[PDB]
Amino acid sequence: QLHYTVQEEQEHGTFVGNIAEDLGLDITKLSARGFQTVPNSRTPYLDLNLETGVLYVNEKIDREQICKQSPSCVLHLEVFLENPLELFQVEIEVLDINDNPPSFPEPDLTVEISESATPGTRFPLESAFDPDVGTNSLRDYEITPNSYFSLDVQTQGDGNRFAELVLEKPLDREQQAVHRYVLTAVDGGGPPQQQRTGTALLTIRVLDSNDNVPAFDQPVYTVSLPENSPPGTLVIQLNATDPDEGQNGEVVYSFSSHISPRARELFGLSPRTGRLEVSGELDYEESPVYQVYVQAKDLGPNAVPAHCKVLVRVLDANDNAPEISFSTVKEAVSEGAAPGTVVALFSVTDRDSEENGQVQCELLGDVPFRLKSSFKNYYTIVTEAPLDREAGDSYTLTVVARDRGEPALSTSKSIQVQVSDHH
């Protein structure tokens, strides 16, 4: 059985092989001997010159069409002679050239990767296809040099290579949500054959994970407000930051566990805006400061609460007037009671603090009495000169206590004293 070879894409009339010579048949006897092609093995790709016995290319051979991706390509032609009957088989092997580049199934590839993918995780890609065979078939892949992905190609026999993306370093959607690289595939064509290349754009969409915690610029905020600040007064507009996407980045504010029930009464916090406002009466006299404990938390899965603390210092106002309290009053005074005779003792108080709780007091009128002070917050009503009126006539003394605030506040109180007869 005879063996010949022929390249694909040879033009009409190309020599394939000399059957007459290779079979020991002299050309002068071929016509007599009935040299002819067997009916079954006729092929439009080969012409057999019967008077010379030479096999030439007739119609051009495209190996990709007759043999597709078969690793072997053989046209089977049969010739025969008569008297005596002799049959000869002729195999014509079609050799592959590299007239096709590798090609990708999709021009644009998009692959979605969670930003929490671990380095070393692999992401499969549809391999490119090259219709040539052997060394002219697919050889290797390459990707744009980058810091995030490398390429892994592996062959498991059967002349095939498969590639998958290898994550090199963690991704962060909050810094870059889309990567675009160029992916290329080359065959092994190296008369001399040249290497061909195919290309596809590659888009990596980084999928969000709830990997960012809400964040306050500082752990403690200090705010100062005047007492009696009306409810609804703005305490502070908190702002937590969470660069995540969707529910992962939406922040809701709430009170922490530590908050006193008193502060929970005195303050209101709107969950979504972070607006901390007054909702009760701030009484400096009750307490000069309050500690508000807040937590913020996003609405995604695995959310981690963040915490901050608002220090609310109350500023004292003058909202308490002095209180006078008389401890004793002498029923009556002797008419000839010499100067300095005590008539009554009393005290003053002011629920405020600092200037607002410091009080100056005065006795009103043009009366023969003066005010003396033995102790702190203690006063005495004394005589100053002899007495205008005697015996039955009574006096009514009124004292005014006034604090040192702005505006100032004052209170008054009266007592009835009378002149009797000296015993």
Ligand X SMILES: *[C@@H]1O[C@H](CO[C@@H]2O[C@@H](C)[C@@H](O)[C@@H](O)[C@@H]2O)[C@@H](O[C@@H]2O[C@H](CO)[C@@H](O[C@@H]3O[C@H](CO[C@H]4O[C@H](CO)[C@@H](O)[C@H](O)[C@@H]4O)[C@@H](O)[C@H](O[C@H]4O[C@H](CO)[C@@H](O)[C@H](O)[C@@H]4O)[C@@H]3O)[C@H](O)[C@H]2NC(C)=O)[C@H](O)[C@H]1NC(C)=O
CB of 185 to ligand MAN, least distance (A): 9
Contacts with ligand MAN, 186-215, as mask; x by CB under 6 A: x--------xxxxx----------------
Among 139, 275, 330, 370, the residue binding a copy of itself under the rule CB under 8 A is 330
Please provide the DSSP assignment of 313-345 as one string: EEE-------EEEEEEE-S-EETT--TT-EEEE
* CA dist., res. 410 & res. 318, Å (int): 11
**Neighbour-count burial of 46, counting CB atoms closer than 10 A to its CB (0-12 exposed, 13-18 middle, 19+ buried):** buried
Q: Determine if residue 157 is left, alpha or beta; phi over 0 gives left, psi from -120 to 50 gives alpha, anything else beta.
A: left
Q: Does 1 bind a copy of itself (CB under 8 A)?
A: yes
User: How many alpha carbons lie under 13 Å from residue 312 in its C-beta half-sphere?
Assistant: 25
User: Could you give the 3-state DSSP secondary structure of residue 27?
Assistant: helix
Among 241, 341, 353, 411, the residue binding ligand X under the rule CB under 6 A is 241
Among 231, 305, 339, 392, the residue binding a copy of itself under the rule CB under 8 A is 305
Of the two residues 31 and 273, which places its CB atom closer to ligand X in the complex? Answer: 273
Among 239, 279, 334, 349, the residue binding ligand X under the rule CB under 6 A is 239
User: Could you give the 3-state DSSP secondary structure of residue 356?
Assistant: helix
- Which residues within the stretch 261-280 sit at the binding site for ligand X (CB under 6 A)? none
CB 213 within 8 A of CB 122: no
Q: Which residues make beta-bridge pairs with 334? A: 420
* CA dist., res. 216 & res. 222, Å (int): 14
Among 302, 338, 407, 423, the residue binding a copy of itself under the rule CB under 8 A is 302
- Of Ca ion, ligand MAN, a copy of itself, none, which one does residue 136 interact with (CB within 5 to 8 Å by kind)? Ca ion
* CA dist., res. 172 & res. 181, Å (int): 17
Residue type, 62: D
Among 13, 24, 84, 191, the residue binding a copy of itself under the rule CB under 8 A is 84
Contacts with a copy of itself, 162-181, as mask; x by CB under 8 A: x-x-----------------
- Which residues within the stretch 104-143 sit at the binding site for a copy of itself (CB under 8 A)? 114-118, 121-127
Instruction: Give CA angle at 358 (278, 399), nearest 5°.
Output: 115
Residues lying near ligand MAN in the complex (CB under 6 A): 182, 184, 186, 195-199
Which residues would be at the binding site for ligand X (CB under 6 A)?
237, 239, 241
Q: Which residues bind a copy of itself (CB under 8 A)?
A: 1, 38-41, 78, 80, 84-85, 87, 89, 114-118, 121-127, 156, 160, 162, 164, 207, 209-210, 256-258, 291, 293, 295, 300-305, 307, 325, 327-328, 330, 342, 345, 374-375, 378
